[PDB]
Assembly symmetry: D3
Homo-oligomer: 235 residues x 6
């Protein structure tokens, strides 16, 4: 896997998954997508949105930044296209404010959909006012420098998950999940299948049908040894 942690390199061309597929994954959401690919790819639950009610997806443009150093953000902007999501990880843990409204302005100018950053962000009310969506480990006004080289479009570890450039990142109020570029098709189909099933179940549950009956659980619960008593005094 070789190129992880390597600095001083910008890879220009990456293979992206396709806009329509990406858009659909965003609408299905993180929980459904995660489940659809057999519960893999979920980033640390410490990666949190700075806004409420936004669910989206995009193709990962990856960035490795030195600790306390945001030099590679401007380098990465040039490599972004509409539909991309910038995915940034520091080379060692850091919660400084790597990113704010100026970089967000530049990203929006390129049609970038969001930032996922395994570090801190600032100018957060301005980011919300601009409608630029961010998932971050911290909110921190502490600034960074521009001294040490990192990389753009090499694989990175972000929130405990490997992210390859061009992988699809899906992000919503619950968290962030990565979908492998080559698995995008299978994951989308599986997630939609799950979504269809859940909608039928939701209607049945809303009508007052019990899940125990819907999912046919009662016999298996009894076989495991579930016992009902009328009153706690019976025990």
């Amino acid at each position: 896997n070789t190129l992880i942690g390597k600095t001083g390199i910008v890879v220009r061309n990456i293979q992206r998954a396709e806009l329509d597929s990406i858009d659909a994954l965003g609408r299905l959401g993180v929980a459904t997508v995660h489940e659809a690919q057999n519960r893999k790819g979920l980033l640390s639950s410490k990666m949190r949105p700075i806004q409420q009610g936004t669910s989206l997806a995009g193709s990962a443009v990856t960035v490795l930044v030195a600790p306390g150093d945001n030099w590679m953000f401007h380098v990465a902007v040039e490599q972004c296209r509409p539909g991309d999501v910038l995915v940034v990880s520091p080379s060692s843990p850091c919660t400084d404010g790597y990113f704010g409204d100026l970089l967000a302005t530049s990203l929006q100018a390129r049609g970038v959909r969001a930032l996922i950053v395994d570090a801190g962000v600032r100018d957060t009310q301005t980011l919300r006012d601009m409608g630029f969506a961010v998932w971050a480990r911290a909110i921190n006004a502490q600034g960074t420098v521009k001294e040490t080289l990192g990389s753009v479009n090499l694989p990175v570890i972000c929130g405990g998950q490997l992210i390859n450039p061009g992988d699809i990142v899906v992000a919503d109020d619950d968290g962030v999940v990565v979908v492998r570029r080559d698995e995008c098709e299978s994951t989308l189909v599986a997630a939609a299948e799950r979504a269809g099933l859940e909608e039928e179940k939701r209607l049945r549950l809303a009508a007052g049908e019990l899940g125990l009956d819907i999912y046919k659980m009662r016999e298996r619960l009894e076989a495991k040894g579930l016992r009902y008593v009328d009153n706690i005094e019976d025990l």
Copy 2:
């Protein structure tokens, strides 16, 4: 206290406190109720609401779930009545997503007012959209299984407090407090007494009367040895 931690049991009948009393406690709020019962019963401050501005109370239907296992949620739904609050604790610490919008749909169909869960929840924007109130230790899309039996309506430890089935749980933006079923009356009266006093004080404070004068503090402060100086250079 015996039955804590016991699995494979569902107690059907629990004695509930009464709807009007429960409703009043919800309106008075967590801080006032906690103070009214001599500062006992408060759950861990890590139990946080996923929404803002909701204050409520209900009769606890308790659930013990195995770690990473939400099997007992559907079992518990059947035992819930309008006005109940589902109170769930894992048998060992876990922040996986035990609960989302499908289970919330089922609970709302029974008139359940909220979930208090000493673990993770997901589908959180959908939960907010549905207006289903939740207090949780974590937001986490990571799913659970249905393999190991737990219990319903046995006592549980949730957020560091013992919760008996039928105890009253009061929850708001500040946190969650448990009121013992047999102490509901005394706590309600004490909380209302506090509320009446605080409203008079609030009016006096808003008018610009100082608490030092209102609460008659000045003489006791002087006796403890509080000393005023005009300028810091005097010291």
Copy 3:
């Protein structure tokens, strides 16, 4: 520095910075102000707002409180004037609910703009409803007592920063920064200079000019050894 940690003292007269200067710092915000004074004065990123979208500043009226003891809040109210911000630190770490809506009512009656507290707060929905802005380490309904003396208008350590009475505290969604009273002028000018520059840059970035070109970064990046490759297979 002597008087830090000393109890039983209230200093009545403090030299304040000036309202217009304070107001301007509030509008410029924490990140800009922090950067303007060479990245000093930022309080712990664990000091968080209980509301969204409020940015302000005021002259610090400082309070040292004993652990689990809010006695000095009422003592401090009397020493506050319009434009002040109450800045409170416990003498040892504590996240109990030191402050709620009654004290907030009293502070608003004096024209106090906010509370910064290195501990817990409660009645938080009421605080939001009143529009009383708070930055706190915790939300916690657990009450306090009034037994042990602290101090008012002596220097305190709050969020890892020394705060002298009359220093300017600037607070927004990103955090809280302290500006030394005697450095208020230089910091304001520097922050406004930064703000002017950033607004021009923002317009250029929004137009689609790259920061690499704007900030003249490309030659220095090449000199550090940044290398572009077309495809990841080239490596």
Copy 4:
């Protein structure tokens, strides 16, 4: 369960489990005992020993202390007998130094075997020098007061587990587990059964027999769909 959180009460007489049974549980250790009672009773993994290599058990003498208040420690000492373990929890979370070498001296004079405290301890090198074993949430020299009443020999929540007076607490380098007084016999027998089995297995494993063969796992692994490949390039 009623009496939890109640203050101002000392229960003099408690039913204890028996010394020999208690001693055996200590020798078997926390992991084995926990497993023997179907993985219940384990206190928070944040409860840690201040020493290395000590494993023991005793009958719980329980103490509820007010936050930052160790008044009840001296009250509790009088109620202790040889073989007891003092189990202390604050009425709300606190990591102050509740306990040090003087109280330890008094406990040792009564033949008390250890302290389990859901808070802080100090004088820790002296405690080690005396050979007084302690499990604590924190090491903290910050002192406490003696102003507010708590209780002795009422049930408490300690490390997230209910502890009744006279329950058996087993503590070692891995943590602390509570064994219900009335379940002491069954747990001891089950723990010894486990210990016997594990010793035979250990000898087989040391000889180089694989667990896959010992525990007869291979057929079930294949049935679940475990697939072997020679080289990673095969995938």
Copy 5:
């Protein structure tokens, strides 16, 4: 990078780095090795040794385990050879006790040098008594199950670093660093070069030569603007 997170697979044959090289890296230690490869490869500082004074290295045999499930440990033992270090990560965060003295006995029988586990361990005093070295995220007696398949000798993320099977893991009291199998030679040479330089410097420093003079820092410090004053009153 594809195979990360995949379950149900055991890769039998992995290319290992060489024993002598591995042994030398262990003697040089984590800090020196980390620095030698330009400060990459360091695992989370939360990965801590359960013993003091042991420094070692080995070839990684990687294991992905389901959360709360240690089934793959016994599967992995069979694939281990003398000199290997078992490197284990759960498919989602978990601090349960995955590993204790029985598995350690089996690993020692195969000549395995250590375990690195991004989760919990138990039987820790027995592990120390056996001299089986472990780096873990937690000490936790809470047991696991054997229900869900994982993988052996596929790449894993452990402590925030990608570990490929056959990579070299170096572990000591300061932490754990991964050295890429194909970079073993360059890293060893660089680490030894650093070690030689540091030993000469250490001798000079012990003799009382100042680093400012040794490393020729004084002129560069002055050029950056470092200013000496005799007394603090001069400022």
Copy 6:
């Protein structure tokens, strides 16, 4: 208080407290010293020793270092004299490895007694082997740079306490406390007074006299309303 956070300055001459007084404070220990000065000056309980059984004190030589930058350590060494303790804080939170065995060698050559660092340290087994005592926030092999100027012998905030150069820092297994240089005499006398009293009490407690009788607590406990019952069934 002005000079806090200022960079680019080295103050050469500081007034030190006196060796014998400092040595005595070290022998009395942190808890006793902290109590003697009315429970002030204690650093964060997160500042922990990397060794066991060492208690000491020294005159603070203070260092402000930039984040991830240890340049000022070598600058500070030159300003140290026998008996000094180096006290280091980063200008913003950082847990990188600022310090290891080379710097420790240089400090020992000057007769420096210890390091207190509000950040990370490495080479920790070597530090123990050398007998160089350290209190740190973290153990972390991640290296630092030498690019940004800090200060030496200006006041710093370390572990949440203001430390002036020449203040006395006392450090042991329980933590670290700062004693103001001008209060050294009063604190030493008060700490020795406490120590004398505690030794008499210890002898009485060891003999089996109860603290309730020794400290004359029984009447005050009864007056507060402490009630004894024989059996828990009485309630």
